[PDB]
Amino acid sequence: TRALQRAVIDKTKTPIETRFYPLDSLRTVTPKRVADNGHAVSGAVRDAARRLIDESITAVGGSKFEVNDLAQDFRNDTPADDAFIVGVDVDYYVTEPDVLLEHMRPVVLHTFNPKKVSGFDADSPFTIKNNLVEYKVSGGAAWVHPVWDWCEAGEFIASRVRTSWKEWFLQLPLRMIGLEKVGYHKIHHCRPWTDCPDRALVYTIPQYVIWRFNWIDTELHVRKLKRIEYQDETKPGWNRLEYVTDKNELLVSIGREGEHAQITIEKEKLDMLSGLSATQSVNARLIGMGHKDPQYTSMIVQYYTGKKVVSPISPTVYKPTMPR
Amino acid sequence: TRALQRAVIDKTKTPIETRFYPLDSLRTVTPKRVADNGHAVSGAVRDAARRLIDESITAVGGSKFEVNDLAQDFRNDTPADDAFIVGVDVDYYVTEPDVLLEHMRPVVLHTFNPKKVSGFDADSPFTIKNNLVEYKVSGGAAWVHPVWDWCEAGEFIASRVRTSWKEWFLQLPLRMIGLEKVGYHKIHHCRPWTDCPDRALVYTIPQYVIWRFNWIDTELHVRKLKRIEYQDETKPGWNRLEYVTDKNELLVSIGREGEHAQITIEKEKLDMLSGLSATQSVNARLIGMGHKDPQYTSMIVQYYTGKKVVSPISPTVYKPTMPR
Amino acid sequence: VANDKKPSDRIAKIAETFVKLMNGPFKDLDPLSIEETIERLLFILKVSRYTLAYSDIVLHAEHNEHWYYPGRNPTEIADGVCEFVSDCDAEVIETDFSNLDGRVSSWMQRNIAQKAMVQAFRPEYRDEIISFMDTIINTTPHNTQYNGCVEFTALTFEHPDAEPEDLFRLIGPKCGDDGLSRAIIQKSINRAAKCFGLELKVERYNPEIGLCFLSRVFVDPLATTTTIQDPLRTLRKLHLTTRDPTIPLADAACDRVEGYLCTDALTPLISDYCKMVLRLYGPTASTEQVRNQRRSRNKEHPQDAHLMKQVLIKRTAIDEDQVDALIGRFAAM
């Protein structure tokens, strides 16, 4: 329509680049196993992530502003303009990723983006209820936070930008109409640790700012970060997750909310099984495929029938921490 | 909200540190087996704990104030300010851990924090009814006391502080409003004996005091010690317990209240089994896994169906004590 | 043979401390102009323009003269070696690396050399230097930086309780693939090399066989500074000439013996060979101006003469009567 022409013509962009040196070291880093034997600890994973980011930043020679809610309150530290923003396990701390992206500066972020719907991340048990991850840090408190969908398709993002109260007064009449000052970013996530596949090393570069119309679509269909909806609308009380394997396999993870048991299966198998008429047929087919483990077939059958169980909340005793 | 700003700004803390030397000896102590052969006796475990704490304190060169209800009545002994507070099996004696934590001094405490819902602790039978542990000391009387949740996630605690009657008069109008004088502590629990995994060697250091608002939440979600609720709200008459193993396993312990039989199972298995439609299916799956012991599968089935049995109270004959 | 053996977590702090001590008081630097680089001392020029300035500024500073011997005249090298051996009371160890440029790992390259260059040079030149380092990853200063890093790692492992500045102040002379260190870390050096992923060869100092350093043999470093070409490396191969086929044998031999006279005039078992080459190939060689105008020309203390003779005999494990017989045979040919 002619409205599309308005958006196409109205570029009015102001590209800004404070010579942010591309951090090619973070991009294209081979998978690594931090723990020589056994399984790594959460503190060890955090230390490895910090060391990797530190080495990259120092090798490039840039500066950094580590964050350890709506405003970062960077004034108390006043870092340089060219310095990067680095955050580790700050999902609980930051209300939104927009808080980090308003600064219109490159962001290096190590986050929790699970590929299993429940289980252990390193030594830290975690579980998803409603749509909030009930993470339990090994040697720490209990974190309750959502996941902000870093790994969905699309490299271009829309985010807010910093605005003062005077700027707020200036733009509020324009804001209510549907006019927003939107910055654009390019995302890269690496997934660098094999033993802990639930944590992603997100990397981001800003590209340029733009004024956009709220009630007008975009030709490139740029997306803005949204909270993930783990709940399965077809089977109440169940969480469903899909992810793509490196060997060209589209697996799916199923499980109940506020619950520990979890199984991964090829998506095609789940779609075939979800249409079977009888419960006994599910077991017959699963035995046909060669799955003899009861823990697998029983969970598949329970998902097929949508069995809801009100599991209780019970006291937990956590592993003793050792500084080493 | 703006109320959150009030709490954030209102630090008004008065850190106090009477050069309490960190007891690094207690932290990071490898597991030990007190009894060379057979199983250790409760008195032997108590002696070992006392010896370990004594050696640590003397090596650090500090002093101690051993406790053997609301007020410790330390005036009769007037220990030094720098001396530590040490208690062994004082769960029955002390009404609350707040009694120990009001002194705003480091606490070394050896407590009963079971990981089995019932059975034997060393040679002492113990059982949980309602929410009180019916401990039966080997060579002693019968102790009835709750558990005060030392091992939950979170290293920071809230506790009362000593206040005189004049201080009570001063702070009562403020206290009723919702203003409390709260101290903060850092916890470490070690679990040092393998043959007696139900006893934990709790260690504590105070950090600083603060004035807090009762009806305002805390950003860090600091927790205050609460009585454990062993009762399972889903299956009346049953006690459920969860704990994390060193080998990355989340086991669960189930059993009836005022009852002796007890079994530990992986949590995932229990969640899978709790959703099965038929009782015979539980046995079928359990045989599939390879569990041939009737004492295990029968208890699992009873938990699944929530079978309640009114076991009687009967006379008991205890083992004769020998001073050796 | 490329390697990607990243170091351990603990070693990273040691490497960062060593890099900071290398930085010292020279926070800011500027690149050199093309003309100045050209008159200093294609593909070599683009990296040299920055690396020569970086070396001259930082590596030749007051607080970095303790270890960066590479970059001084041979008389200065001899003086430094004699001073170091006098300080260590003839208790020194030698390091011999095999294909260091072919064995340095990516982590070492990007956390020692790149870090040092970026800290030394101005921020406005960061992109150029980082691009040059990236091109390098996929000359002289790199070997010195690696040797300094390994020395710092050894010193940190030996005395973990001392301050990093005091630890680094003890760094002995180092020059590329060759260097000197205290003998007290002879066994611990292998473990440090294994942690970084490098291969190290170490030999205890022995006065009977002399000391090996920069292919130079110190006959008696305790008293005299007299030094000679390494006999072990050259004697077994001096009879064969590795010059290109286009050069006549006479010109190559004449250049070799001229260099030997310039460096090893009074060394036993080499002076006779050089004189016999000059006597035989000399007259048959071409004009010396012709070879001075030819590209392949550059492609090559009397008081302790007795002691030098005995030290050479010990180095070559040849009996004195056998040495005399060999000398007589060489002269009479």
PDB file of C-alpha atoms in Angstrom, chain B residues 34-260:
ATOM      1  CA  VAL B  34      35.351 -42.333  62.663  1.00  0.00           C
ATOM      2  CA  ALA B  35      34.793 -46.080  63.175  1.00  0.00           C
ATOM      3  CA  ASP B  36      37.518 -48.368  61.854  1.00  0.00           C
ATOM      4  CA  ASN B  37      35.181 -51.387  61.707  1.00  0.00           C
ATOM      5  CA  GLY B  38      31.445 -51.837  62.033  1.00  0.00           C
ATOM      6  CA  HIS B  39      29.446 -48.651  62.554  1.00  0.00           C
ATOM      7  CA  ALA B  40      30.283 -45.795  64.896  1.00  0.00           C
ATOM      8  CA  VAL B  41      28.368 -45.054  68.087  1.00  0.00           C
ATOM      9  CA  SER B  42      26.545 -41.789  68.753  1.00  0.00           C
ATOM     10  CA  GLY B  43      28.889 -41.007  71.635  1.00  0.00           C
ATOM     11  CA  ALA B  44      31.863 -41.665  69.367  1.00  0.00           C
ATOM     12  CA  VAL B  45      30.480 -39.267  66.745  1.00  0.00           C
ATOM     13  CA  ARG B  46      29.923 -36.606  69.404  1.00  0.00           C
ATOM     14  CA  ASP B  47      33.469 -37.076  70.695  1.00  0.00           C
ATOM     15  CA  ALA B  48      34.883 -36.810  67.169  1.00  0.00           C
ATOM     16  CA  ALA B  49      32.944 -33.603  66.494  1.00  0.00           C
ATOM     17  CA  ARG B  50      34.091 -32.097  69.789  1.00  0.00           C
ATOM     18  CA  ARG B  51      37.703 -33.062  69.081  1.00  0.00           C
ATOM     19  CA  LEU B  52      37.599 -31.570  65.580  1.00  0.00           C
ATOM     20  CA  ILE B  53      36.119 -28.271  66.757  1.00  0.00           C
ATOM     21  CA  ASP B  54      38.529 -28.121  69.709  1.00  0.00           C
ATOM     22  CA  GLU B  55      41.546 -28.712  67.475  1.00  0.00           C
ATOM     23  CA  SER B  56      40.410 -26.058  65.001  1.00  0.00           C
ATOM     24  CA  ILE B  57      39.743 -23.442  67.685  1.00  0.00           C
ATOM     25  CA  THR B  58      42.999 -24.077  69.552  1.00  0.00           C
ATOM     26  CA  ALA B  59      45.044 -24.047  66.336  1.00  0.00           C
ATOM     27  CA  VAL B  60      43.523 -20.675  65.461  1.00  0.00           C
ATOM     28  CA  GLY B  61      44.177 -19.711  69.086  1.00  0.00           C
ATOM     29  CA  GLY B  62      40.719 -18.284  69.768  1.00  0.00           C
ATOM     30  CA  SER B  63      38.403 -18.982  72.682  1.00  0.00           C
ATOM     31  CA  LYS B  64      35.049 -20.742  72.852  1.00  0.00           C
ATOM     32  CA  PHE B  65      31.827 -20.709  74.876  1.00  0.00           C
ATOM     33  CA  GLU B  66      30.356 -24.210  74.792  1.00  0.00           C
ATOM     34  CA  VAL B  67      26.617 -24.563  75.432  1.00  0.00           C
ATOM     35  CA  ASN B  68      25.512 -27.753  77.177  1.00  0.00           C
ATOM     36  CA  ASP B  69      16.121 -21.328  76.624  1.00  0.00           C
ATOM     37  CA  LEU B  70      15.525 -17.925  75.038  1.00  0.00           C
ATOM     38  CA  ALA B  71      18.715 -16.552  76.649  1.00  0.00           C
ATOM     39  CA  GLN B  72      21.951 -18.521  76.943  1.00  0.00           C
ATOM     40  CA  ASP B  73      22.591 -17.027  80.414  1.00  0.00           C
ATOM     41  CA  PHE B  74      26.246 -16.542  79.465  1.00  0.00           C
ATOM     42  CA  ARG B  75      26.574 -14.064  82.352  1.00  0.00           C
ATOM     43  CA  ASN B  76      27.253 -16.968  84.728  1.00  0.00           C
ATOM     44  CA  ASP B  77      30.401 -17.755  82.696  1.00  0.00           C
ATOM     45  CA  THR B  78      31.139 -14.343  81.088  1.00  0.00           C
ATOM     46  CA  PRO B  79      33.290 -15.586  78.174  1.00  0.00           C
ATOM     47  CA  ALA B  80      35.384 -13.219  76.089  1.00  0.00           C
ATOM     48  CA  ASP B  81      33.853 -11.157  73.297  1.00  0.00           C
ATOM     49  CA  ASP B  82      36.068 -12.783  70.644  1.00  0.00           C
ATOM     50  CA  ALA B  83      35.273 -16.326  71.814  1.00  0.00           C
ATOM     51  CA  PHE B  84      33.234 -18.548  69.512  1.00  0.00           C
ATOM     52  CA  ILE B  85      29.914 -20.242  70.282  1.00  0.00           C
ATOM     53  CA  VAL B  86      29.969 -24.043  70.029  1.00  0.00           C
ATOM     54  CA  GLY B  87      27.011 -26.390  70.393  1.00  0.00           C
ATOM     55  CA  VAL B  88      26.729 -30.152  69.849  1.00  0.00           C
ATOM     56  CA  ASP B  89      23.365 -31.935  69.617  1.00  0.00           C
ATOM     57  CA  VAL B  90      21.720 -28.885  71.187  1.00  0.00           C
ATOM     58  CA  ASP B  91      18.741 -29.067  68.834  1.00  0.00           C
ATOM     59  CA  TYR B  92      16.520 -30.311  71.663  1.00  0.00           C
ATOM     60  CA  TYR B  93      17.926 -27.753  74.103  1.00  0.00           C
ATOM     61  CA  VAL B  94      17.662 -24.582  71.998  1.00  0.00           C
ATOM     62  CA  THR B  95      14.157 -23.377  71.176  1.00  0.00           C
ATOM     63  CA  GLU B  96      15.340 -21.584  68.026  1.00  0.00           C
ATOM     64  CA  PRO B  97      18.626 -20.986  66.200  1.00  0.00           C
ATOM     65  CA  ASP B  98      17.818 -17.314  66.734  1.00  0.00           C
ATOM     66  CA  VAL B  99      18.833 -17.863  70.367  1.00  0.00           C
ATOM     67  CA  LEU B 100      22.356 -18.604  69.149  1.00  0.00           C
ATOM     68  CA  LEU B 101      22.369 -15.976  66.402  1.00  0.00           C
ATOM     69  CA  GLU B 102      21.296 -13.000  68.549  1.00  0.00           C
ATOM     70  CA  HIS B 103      24.750 -12.803  70.145  1.00  0.00           C
ATOM     71  CA  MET B 104      25.980 -11.427  66.788  1.00  0.00           C
ATOM     72  CA  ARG B 105      29.016 -13.714  67.065  1.00  0.00           C
ATOM     73  CA  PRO B 106      30.382 -16.605  64.991  1.00  0.00           C
ATOM     74  CA  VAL B 107      28.642 -19.931  65.600  1.00  0.00           C
ATOM     75  CA  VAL B 108      30.006 -23.446  65.101  1.00  0.00           C
ATOM     76  CA  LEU B 109      27.114 -25.882  65.382  1.00  0.00           C
ATOM     77  CA  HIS B 110      26.855 -29.649  64.916  1.00  0.00           C
ATOM     78  CA  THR B 111      23.226 -30.465  64.169  1.00  0.00           C
ATOM     79  CA  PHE B 112      20.876 -33.168  62.950  1.00  0.00           C
ATOM     80  CA  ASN B 113      19.827 -32.431  59.360  1.00  0.00           C
ATOM     81  CA  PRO B 114      18.675 -35.796  58.029  1.00  0.00           C
ATOM     82  CA  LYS B 115      18.891 -36.812  54.392  1.00  0.00           C
ATOM     83  CA  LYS B 116      16.913 -39.989  55.119  1.00  0.00           C
ATOM     84  CA  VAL B 117      13.313 -39.450  56.211  1.00  0.00           C
ATOM     85  CA  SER B 118      13.649 -42.293  58.737  1.00  0.00           C
ATOM     86  CA  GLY B 119      16.041 -44.991  59.882  1.00  0.00           C
ATOM     87  CA  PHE B 120      19.144 -44.994  62.085  1.00  0.00           C
ATOM     88  CA  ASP B 121      21.559 -42.146  62.731  1.00  0.00           C
ATOM     89  CA  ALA B 122      24.706 -43.962  63.867  1.00  0.00           C
ATOM     90  CA  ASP B 123      23.171 -46.305  66.493  1.00  0.00           C
ATOM     91  CA  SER B 124      20.282 -43.970  67.364  1.00  0.00           C
ATOM     92  CA  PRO B 125      16.866 -44.704  65.805  1.00  0.00           C
ATOM     93  CA  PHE B 126      14.996 -41.635  64.610  1.00  0.00           C
ATOM     94  CA  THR B 127      11.629 -40.947  63.009  1.00  0.00           C
ATOM     95  CA  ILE B 128       9.585 -37.949  61.868  1.00  0.00           C
ATOM     96  CA  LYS B 129       5.963 -37.423  62.897  1.00  0.00           C
ATOM     97  CA  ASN B 130       3.951 -34.334  62.051  1.00  0.00           C
ATOM     98  CA  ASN B 131       7.043 -32.149  61.586  1.00  0.00           C
ATOM     99  CA  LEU B 132       9.047 -33.075  64.709  1.00  0.00           C
ATOM    100  CA  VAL B 133      11.916 -35.567  64.742  1.00  0.00           C
ATOM    101  CA  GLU B 134      11.381 -38.289  67.359  1.00  0.00           C
ATOM    102  CA  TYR B 135      15.078 -38.925  67.893  1.00  0.00           C
ATOM    103  CA  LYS B 136      16.047 -41.722  70.300  1.00  0.00           C
ATOM    104  CA  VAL B 137      19.600 -41.193  71.533  1.00  0.00           C
ATOM    105  CA  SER B 138      21.691 -44.336  71.900  1.00  0.00           C
ATOM    106  CA  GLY B 139      22.408 -44.298  75.622  1.00  0.00           C
ATOM    107  CA  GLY B 140      20.172 -41.308  76.319  1.00  0.00           C
ATOM    108  CA  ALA B 141      16.585 -40.096  76.622  1.00  0.00           C
ATOM    109  CA  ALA B 142      14.150 -39.505  73.743  1.00  0.00           C
ATOM    110  CA  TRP B 143      14.525 -36.143  71.993  1.00  0.00           C
ATOM    111  CA  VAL B 144      11.596 -34.473  70.223  1.00  0.00           C
ATOM    112  CA  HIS B 145      12.618 -31.413  68.213  1.00  0.00           C
ATOM    113  CA  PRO B 146      12.153 -29.925  64.731  1.00  0.00           C
ATOM    114  CA  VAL B 147      14.799 -29.143  62.111  1.00  0.00           C
ATOM    115  CA  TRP B 148      15.552 -25.487  61.405  1.00  0.00           C
ATOM    116  CA  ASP B 149      16.515 -25.670  57.724  1.00  0.00           C
ATOM    117  CA  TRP B 150      20.242 -24.935  57.763  1.00  0.00           C
ATOM    118  CA  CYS B 151      20.910 -26.467  54.344  1.00  0.00           C
ATOM    119  CA  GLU B 152      18.514 -24.552  52.081  1.00  0.00           C
ATOM    120  CA  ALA B 153      19.940 -22.411  49.297  1.00  0.00           C
ATOM    121  CA  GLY B 154      21.149 -18.966  50.303  1.00  0.00           C
ATOM    122  CA  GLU B 155      24.136 -17.956  52.415  1.00  0.00           C
ATOM    123  CA  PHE B 156      22.613 -14.786  53.901  1.00  0.00           C
ATOM    124  CA  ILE B 157      20.306 -14.936  56.927  1.00  0.00           C
ATOM    125  CA  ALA B 158      18.103 -12.643  58.997  1.00  0.00           C
ATOM    126  CA  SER B 159      18.037 -12.928  62.782  1.00  0.00           C
ATOM    127  CA  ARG B 160      17.247 -11.013  65.947  1.00  0.00           C
ATOM    128  CA  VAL B 161      19.788  -9.188  68.108  1.00  0.00           C
ATOM    129  CA  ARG B 162      19.992  -8.840  71.876  1.00  0.00           C
ATOM    130  CA  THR B 163      17.869  -6.052  73.349  1.00  0.00           C
ATOM    131  CA  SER B 164      17.430  -4.986  76.967  1.00  0.00           C
ATOM    132  CA  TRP B 165      14.080  -4.084  78.516  1.00  0.00           C
ATOM    133  CA  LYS B 166      14.902  -0.388  78.141  1.00  0.00           C
ATOM    134  CA  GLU B 167      15.814  -1.134  74.528  1.00  0.00           C
ATOM    135  CA  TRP B 168      12.573  -3.121  74.353  1.00  0.00           C
ATOM    136  CA  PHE B 169      10.626  -0.064  75.516  1.00  0.00           C
ATOM    137  CA  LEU B 170      12.481   2.100  72.993  1.00  0.00           C
ATOM    138  CA  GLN B 171      11.880  -0.205  70.020  1.00  0.00           C
ATOM    139  CA  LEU B 172       8.398  -1.598  70.760  1.00  0.00           C
ATOM    140  CA  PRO B 173       6.554   1.348  69.125  1.00  0.00           C
ATOM    141  CA  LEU B 174       8.936   0.982  66.181  1.00  0.00           C
ATOM    142  CA  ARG B 175       8.667  -2.817  66.275  1.00  0.00           C
ATOM    143  CA  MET B 176       4.869  -2.820  65.975  1.00  0.00           C
ATOM    144  CA  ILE B 177       5.115  -0.610  62.881  1.00  0.00           C
ATOM    145  CA  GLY B 178       7.286  -3.220  61.161  1.00  0.00           C
ATOM    146  CA  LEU B 179      10.825  -2.058  61.914  1.00  0.00           C
ATOM    147  CA  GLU B 180      13.320  -4.690  63.054  1.00  0.00           C
ATOM    148  CA  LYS B 181      17.014  -4.717  63.938  1.00  0.00           C
ATOM    149  CA  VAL B 182      18.343  -7.510  61.729  1.00  0.00           C
ATOM    150  CA  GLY B 183      21.812  -9.041  61.644  1.00  0.00           C
ATOM    151  CA  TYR B 184      23.279 -10.901  58.684  1.00  0.00           C
ATOM    152  CA  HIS B 185      25.252 -14.152  58.663  1.00  0.00           C
ATOM    153  CA  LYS B 186      27.153 -16.310  56.179  1.00  0.00           C
ATOM    154  CA  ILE B 187      26.581 -20.071  56.441  1.00  0.00           C
ATOM    155  CA  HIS B 188      28.790 -23.016  55.563  1.00  0.00           C
ATOM    156  CA  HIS B 189      27.858 -26.652  56.147  1.00  0.00           C
ATOM    157  CA  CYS B 190      30.341 -29.438  55.484  1.00  0.00           C
ATOM    158  CA  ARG B 191      28.769 -32.879  56.094  1.00  0.00           C
ATOM    159  CA  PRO B 192      32.087 -34.416  57.207  1.00  0.00           C
ATOM    160  CA  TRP B 193      31.168 -38.024  58.130  1.00  0.00           C
ATOM    161  CA  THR B 194      30.310 -40.560  55.422  1.00  0.00           C
ATOM    162  CA  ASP B 195      29.020 -43.335  57.702  1.00  0.00           C
ATOM    163  CA  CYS B 196      26.633 -40.809  59.326  1.00  0.00           C
ATOM    164  CA  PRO B 197      25.371 -38.658  56.432  1.00  0.00           C
ATOM    165  CA  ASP B 198      22.482 -37.297  58.520  1.00  0.00           C
ATOM    166  CA  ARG B 199      24.621 -34.917  60.635  1.00  0.00           C
ATOM    167  CA  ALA B 200      25.952 -31.613  59.309  1.00  0.00           C
ATOM    168  CA  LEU B 201      28.797 -29.475  60.657  1.00  0.00           C
ATOM    169  CA  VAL B 202      27.280 -26.003  60.331  1.00  0.00           C
ATOM    170  CA  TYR B 203      29.596 -22.985  60.378  1.00  0.00           C
ATOM    171  CA  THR B 204      28.545 -19.337  60.479  1.00  0.00           C
ATOM    172  CA  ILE B 205      30.113 -15.867  60.357  1.00  0.00           C
ATOM    173  CA  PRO B 206      28.245 -12.595  61.003  1.00  0.00           C
ATOM    174  CA  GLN B 207      28.666  -9.837  58.426  1.00  0.00           C
ATOM    175  CA  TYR B 208      26.802  -6.676  59.484  1.00  0.00           C
ATOM    176  CA  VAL B 209      23.610  -5.345  61.059  1.00  0.00           C
ATOM    177  CA  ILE B 210      20.822  -3.412  59.338  1.00  0.00           C
ATOM    178  CA  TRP B 211      17.443  -1.810  59.976  1.00  0.00           C
ATOM    179  CA  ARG B 212      14.833  -3.266  57.622  1.00  0.00           C
ATOM    180  CA  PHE B 213      11.165  -2.648  56.845  1.00  0.00           C
ATOM    181  CA  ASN B 214       8.874  -5.593  57.541  1.00  0.00           C
ATOM    182  CA  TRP B 215       6.371  -4.886  54.746  1.00  0.00           C
ATOM    183  CA  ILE B 216       9.015  -4.206  52.062  1.00  0.00           C
ATOM    184  CA  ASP B 217      10.706  -6.897  50.001  1.00  0.00           C
ATOM    185  CA  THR B 218      14.470  -7.268  49.630  1.00  0.00           C
ATOM    186  CA  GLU B 219      16.298  -7.154  46.308  1.00  0.00           C
ATOM    187  CA  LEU B 220      18.571 -10.091  47.190  1.00  0.00           C
ATOM    188  CA  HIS B 221      15.650 -12.090  48.655  1.00  0.00           C
ATOM    189  CA  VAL B 222      17.464 -12.835  51.902  1.00  0.00           C
ATOM    190  CA  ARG B 223      15.841 -15.667  53.857  1.00  0.00           C
ATOM    191  CA  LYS B 224      15.167 -16.275  57.541  1.00  0.00           C
ATOM    192  CA  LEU B 225      15.407 -19.737  59.062  1.00  0.00           C
ATOM    193  CA  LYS B 226      12.088 -21.584  59.178  1.00  0.00           C
ATOM    194  CA  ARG B 227      10.952 -24.955  60.468  1.00  0.00           C
ATOM    195  CA  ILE B 228      11.061 -27.653  57.796  1.00  0.00           C
ATOM    196  CA  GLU B 229       7.691 -29.030  56.661  1.00  0.00           C
ATOM    197  CA  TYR B 230       8.398 -32.714  56.045  1.00  0.00           C
ATOM    198  CA  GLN B 231       4.711 -33.572  55.593  1.00  0.00           C
ATOM    199  CA  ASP B 232       3.658 -34.217  51.997  1.00  0.00           C
ATOM    200  CA  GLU B 233       0.608 -32.085  51.213  1.00  0.00           C
ATOM    201  CA  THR B 234      -0.259 -34.321  48.233  1.00  0.00           C
ATOM    202  CA  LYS B 235      -0.148 -37.675  50.084  1.00  0.00           C
ATOM    203  CA  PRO B 236      -1.416 -37.274  53.669  1.00  0.00           C
ATOM    204  CA  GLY B 237       0.428 -39.395  56.199  1.00  0.00           C
ATOM    205  CA  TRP B 238       3.648 -39.433  54.153  1.00  0.00           C
ATOM    206  CA  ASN B 239       6.947 -37.582  54.500  1.00  0.00           C
ATOM    207  CA  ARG B 240       8.838 -36.543  51.368  1.00  0.00           C
ATOM    208  CA  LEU B 241      12.429 -35.306  51.254  1.00  0.00           C
ATOM    209  CA  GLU B 242      14.725 -34.205  48.424  1.00  0.00           C
ATOM    210  CA  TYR B 243      18.500 -33.839  48.372  1.00  0.00           C
ATOM    211  CA  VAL B 244      21.299 -33.488  45.831  1.00  0.00           C
ATOM    212  CA  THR B 245      24.060 -36.076  45.491  1.00  0.00           C
ATOM    213  CA  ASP B 246      27.721 -35.326  44.830  1.00  0.00           C
ATOM    214  CA  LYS B 247      27.529 -37.299  41.552  1.00  0.00           C
ATOM    215  CA  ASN B 248      24.897 -34.980  40.027  1.00  0.00           C
ATOM    216  CA  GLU B 249      21.830 -36.947  41.137  1.00  0.00           C
ATOM    217  CA  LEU B 250      18.639 -35.512  42.651  1.00  0.00           C
ATOM    218  CA  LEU B 251      17.310 -38.269  44.907  1.00  0.00           C
ATOM    219  CA  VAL B 252      14.099 -38.252  46.950  1.00  0.00           C
ATOM    220  CA  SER B 253      13.256 -40.059  50.195  1.00  0.00           C
ATOM    221  CA  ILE B 254       9.695 -41.146  50.984  1.00  0.00           C
ATOM    222  CA  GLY B 255       8.053 -42.711  54.006  1.00  0.00           C
ATOM    223  CA  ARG B 256       5.161 -42.516  56.414  1.00  0.00           C
ATOM    224  CA  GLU B 257       5.065 -40.354  59.524  1.00  0.00           C
ATOM    225  CA  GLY B 258       5.793 -42.081  62.804  1.00  0.00           C
ATOM    226  CA  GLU B 259       7.119 -44.979  60.743  1.00  0.00           C
ATOM    227  CA  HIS B 260      10.387 -46.792  60.098  1.00  0.00           C
TER     228      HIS B 260
END
